[PDB]
């Protein structure tokens, strides 16, 4: 009969929301995230500042970072958070709007729900709309496969990708900075490139323009001995792991000295060993040495005693960056090193980069080197940090471009044609997916509206004209005059973007919102 009973512990504090009310609730939450992000897109967009739990701060425009820093409590939000994280490491920016695509779709999706329309079909049509989008998109897609050595399609694309970031001050340079960086380290034979070959190095100070990529490697280490000369012209290089001390077999090992002569020979050997390897490197004919591990102060001077500067306590990854950039090897032994394994470079010089600080070491290698570093200088730590991520992201899309050399002029023209392309199908749709079509098409429309609103112009007066031209004309190359240039030919405006970027973007979005539509009920534990 009627009387209380326990099914789940804490049944009192097990709250539960089901069905449409839960559905809209998530939609309400979704829009907040959307409205959170709308301002973050586009050259006229404005970026956000996050404050760390340990009190640190971060200003940024990369929404992935924004959400990564974001601490929500609503679960669906976290899905959005990782969603952007999934998109970023997948492609990169576009994250500038990726979530914004989702929620507005969800916002209008509820409009269908307000029409009582069941999510399952709503899941259905939008996906079909998604497939519709891509096959339209790639049809009207341009390509940079057709291009000669791709010097300045990429520069434009880099120029495009950096107009969303505050580093746009001298972004032309950084556009060049990346393109040189990537082309050097690219495997056209592979269509891939490892970002490890790229060494980001940003030290605060100087102007942004002082940011300078380095065809080589820079070391956050000074000289092993202060008297060692700061510059070195020739670059006969030694790359060492075994620290300059008595070798010690790491199995439990110990000697048991007994007599006088026992002491002396070891004492005798103690120096004798140092001369040996001191001889050993000298016989190799190298000019400079570098060690991962420690030195003995004695042999260090002795190493200084033969004008062979070395570097001590060098972090792992960089050493190989040194090795490969030099083409050099890594020898664990004194005896087994030969001149052939020695690294060579164009120039190595420590830099007293700081006015009042300890210094840095740079290697201006002059031959070919599959690894490279970029040096960033600028006025603020966060400004460095913004640059790194911005610079970091710009690399990917060119890498992304390496995978696919077919792109589209950006600026909002692309998807605009799609909804029109979508809409044209919506007449041959038949039923209720017919409503589903215009819904998503209407959903897709927001991104330009985001732009022009961030452009401060009338969003709708803009796109309505924008459509009609792309309605009147067949050229899908008319976006938003973001920087107030009376030409909608973004192709001439050179605002361009890789096919995949959007292609993965919306395709990613569809699947997420599918799950978003897919759920009805939640049981939240009381905190």
């Amino acid at each position: 009969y009627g009387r209380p009973f326990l099914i789940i512990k804490d049944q009192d504090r097990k709250s539960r929301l089901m069905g449409l009310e839960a559905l809209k609730s998530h939609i309400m939450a979704a829009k907040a995230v959307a409205n959170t992000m709308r301002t973050s897109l586009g050259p006229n967009g404005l970026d956000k500042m996050m404050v760390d739990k340990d009190g640190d701060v971060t200003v940024t425009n990369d929404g992935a970072t924004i959400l990564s820093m974001m601490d929500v409590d609503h679960q669906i939000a976290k899905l959005m958070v990782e969603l952007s994280k999934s998109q970023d490491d997948e492609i990169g920016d576009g994250t500038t709007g990726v979530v914004v695509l989702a929620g507005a779709l969800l916002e209008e999706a509820e409009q269908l729900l307000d029409r009582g329309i069941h999510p399952i079909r709503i899941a259905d049509g939008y996906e079909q709309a998604a497939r519709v989008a891509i096959e339209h998109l790639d049809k009207i897609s341009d390509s940079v496969l057709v291009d000669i050595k791709d010097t300045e399609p990429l520069i434009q694309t880099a120029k495009t990708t950096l107009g969303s970031k505050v580093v746009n001050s001298c972004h032309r340079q950084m556009a060049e900075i990346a393109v040189n960086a990537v082309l050097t380290v690219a495997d056209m034979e592979r269509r891939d490139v490892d970002f490890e070959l790229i060494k980001v190095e940003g030290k605060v100070g100087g102007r942004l323009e002082d940011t300078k990529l380095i065809k080589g490697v820079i070391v956050d280490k000074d000289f092993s001995h202060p008297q060692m000369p700061k510059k070195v012209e020739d670059a006969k290089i030694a790359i060492l792991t075994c620290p300059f001390e008595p070798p010690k077999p790491k199995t439990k090992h110990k000697l048991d000295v007994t007599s006088v002569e026992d002491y002396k020979a070891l004492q005798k050997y103690e120096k004798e060993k140092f001369e040996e390897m001191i001889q050993q490197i000298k016989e190799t004919g190298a000019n400079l040495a570098i060690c991962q591990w420690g030195f003995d102060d004695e042999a260090n001077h002795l190493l200084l005693q033969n004008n062979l500067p070395a570097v001590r306590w060098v972090g792992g990854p960089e050493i190989e960056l040194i090795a490969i950039a030099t083409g050099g090897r890594i020898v664990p032994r004194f005896s087994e090193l030969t001149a052939e394994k020695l690294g060579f470079a164009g120039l190595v010089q420590e830099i007293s980069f700081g006015t009042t600080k300890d210094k840095m070491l740079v290697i201006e290698q002059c031959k070919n080197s599959r690894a490279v570093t970029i040096f960033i200088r600028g006025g603020n730590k966060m400004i460095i940090e913004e640059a790194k991520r911005s610079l970091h992201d710009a690399l990917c899309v060119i890498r992304n471009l390496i995978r696919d050399n077919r792109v589209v002029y950006g600026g909002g023209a692309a998807e605009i044609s799609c909804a029109l392309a979508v809409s044209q199908e919506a007449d041959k749709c038949p039923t209720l997916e017919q409503y589903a079509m215009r819904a998503f098409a209407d959903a897709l429309e927001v991104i330009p509206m985001a732009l022009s609103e961030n452009s401060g112009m009338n969003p709708i007066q803009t796109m309505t004209e924008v459509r009609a031209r792309q309605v009147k004309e067949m050229n899908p190359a008319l976006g938003i005059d973001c920087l107030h240039k009376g030409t909608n030919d973004m192709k001439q405006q050179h605002v361009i973007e890789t096919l995949i970027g959007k292609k993965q973007q919306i395709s990613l979005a569809t699947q997420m919102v599918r799950m978003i539509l897919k759920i009805d009920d939640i049981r939240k534990p009381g905190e």
Binding site: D114, R115, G116, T431, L432, Y435, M449, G456, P459, I460
Partner: protein, 518 residues
């Protein structure tokens, strides 16, 4: 172009919209032939059932300000129509939903209202076009109107009996000629616990909830009624008075004389020939004396004390008998007469006074409610009351429209093309504006559990040549001629609804901020 610095207003706007939509969607369930009544338990502990949204909202203890105006909005609609309080709010919120739509569409709210001001002007024009003028004398169409209102609440159980009761009552209280706006308070409602809703009754006469004071007089024939205001007890002055005793014969002389005074009092009353007594409250001072009742009962006269000053006009409006406040004025010339009057015996012992038949027919009338659930009785009369209201609303305008959402889809359709006609961003607003009306038919199919989108669009598709007569049928569960379904509502109902919403949302748009106060 110009740059917008602040967003506090916009978000504040959105907050209201989200609230309103949530509110309307909550109410959305209850509407129409498939409306579903709701229940509230008071924090004081009271419990209420209700199908009319207004009463829901007057029960609603809303925290957020905006819907409180929407709550207020319906009360005017209730003070105007009576149903569609149901319908009107869902219209109101739906407007804001599209009003939300336009908000991220960046259009400044001011133009929206004027566009809506234009949008309403078309509709009120259109609704005038589609309505059906009908003279008041056609009882059945009134009846057709009636059940159309009535098949929205639980009273649908005995609707077929309830509807005639309503309309006949209106006919008896109205003048079928002046086509004025006759008050309903001239109709009395009697909430009598128990009985059956089927056993709810009309009284062509007078009924008083109070009980007799005579033990022995129960039923009276050919009653001559008297309503008396001045008390019948020891004469007590407005100002301070006191009998002083200092002598011998004072005792009995006082003692005897009060009865004598009382005696002549009753003696004159009997001399008048009245036989039924009506006595008001005299809470300031003495009431009817016990002794007089002894005499009046000795004189075998029907008597009732404790008559509310508020009802007295209605009763003399009912009985056509001017009261008396001084003996000399008390005269058979004013003595009312009734064919019969007595106290009925129901509820086992819930006994009630009845007065049937009056030589002077007052326009007023009373209404008896019987039925098991106490709450159901109260909801029934609410349905009954609104049933009266819509008739009076219909009395206001001799024009008729089918119910069941057909006017709305016509309108939105009619708006759809006229919006196409109008250029400028206003078209979208009207485009949105029409799309707001789209909700109600969708709601019907929802409460009908039928595929709304397929139906309503087909309802549009038919209605492109399937004009206002046709629409979605509940009973068959399809789309048919609603006029042929005899589901019809007065023009002003939606008119008031449409009009009232329009002004409010305009006021809604002008809002930019709320400031917490002391």
């Amino acid at each position: 172009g110009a740059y917008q610095d602040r967003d506090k207003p916009a978000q504040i706007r959105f907050s209201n919209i989200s609230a309103a939509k949530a509110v309307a969607d909550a109410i959305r369930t209850s509407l129409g032939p498939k409306g579903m009544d709701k229940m509230i338990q008071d924090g004081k502990g009271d419990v209420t059932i209700t199908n009319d949204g207004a009463t829901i909202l007057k029960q609603m203890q809303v925290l957020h300000p905006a819907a409180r105006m929407l709550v207020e909005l319906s009360k005017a609609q209730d003070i105007e129509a009576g149903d569609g309080t149901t319908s009107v709010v869902i219209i109101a919120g739906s407007l804001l939903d599209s009003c939300t739509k336009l908000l991220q569409k960046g259009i400044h709210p001011t133009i929206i209202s004027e566009s809506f001001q234009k949008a309403l002007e078309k509709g009120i024009e259109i609704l005038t076009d589609m309505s059906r003028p009908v003279e008041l004398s056609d009882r059945e169409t009134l009846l057709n109107s009636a059940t159309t209102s009535l098949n929205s609440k639980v009273v649908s159980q005995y609707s077929s009996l309830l509807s005639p009761m309503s309309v006949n009552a209106v006919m008896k209280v109205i003048d079928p000629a002046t086509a004025t706006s006759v008050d309903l308070r001239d109709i009395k409602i009697v909430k009598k616990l128990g009985g059956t809703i089927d056993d709810c009754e009309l009284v062509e006469g007078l009924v008083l909830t109070q009980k007799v004071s005579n033990s022995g007089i129960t039923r009276v024939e050919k009653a001559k009624i008297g309503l008396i205001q001045f008390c019948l007890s020891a004469p007590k002055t407005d100002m301070d008075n006191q009998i002083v005793v200092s002598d011998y014969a004072q005792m009995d002389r006082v003692l005897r004389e009060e009865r004598a005074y009382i005696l002549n009092l009753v003696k004159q009353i009997k001399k008048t020939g009245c036989n039924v007594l009506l006595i008001q409250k005299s809470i300031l001072r003495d009431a009817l004396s016990d002794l007089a009742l002894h005499f009046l009962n000795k004189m075998k006269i029907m008597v009732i004390k404790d008559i509310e000053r508020e009802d007295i006009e209605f009763i003399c409006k009912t009985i056509g008998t001017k009261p008396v406040a001084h003996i000399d004025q008390f005269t058979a010339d004013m003595l009312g007469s009734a064919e019969l009057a007595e106290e009925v015996n129901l509820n086992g012992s819930g006994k009630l006074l009845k007065i049937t038949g009056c030589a002077s027919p007052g326009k007023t009338v009373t209404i008896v409610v019987r039925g098991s659930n106490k709450l159901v009785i109260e909801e029934a009369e609410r349905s009954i009351h609104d049933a009266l209201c819509v008739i009076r609303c219909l009395v206001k305008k001799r024009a008729l429209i089918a119910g069941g959402g057909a006017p709305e889809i016509e309108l939105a359709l009619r708006l759809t093309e006229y919006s196409r006609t109008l250029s400028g961003m206003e078209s979208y607003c009207v485009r949105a504006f029409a799309d707001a009306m789209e909700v109600i038919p969708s709601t019907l199919a929802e409460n009908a559990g039928l595929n709304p989108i397929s139906t309503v669009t087909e309802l549009r598709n038919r209605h492109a040549q399937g004009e206002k007569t046709a629409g979605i049928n509940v009973r068959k569960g399809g789309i048919s001629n609603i006029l042929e379904e005899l589901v019809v509502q007065p023009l002003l109902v939606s008119v008031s609804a449409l009009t009232l919403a329009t002004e409010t949302v305009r006021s809604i748009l002008k809002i930019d901020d709320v400031v917490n106060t002391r």
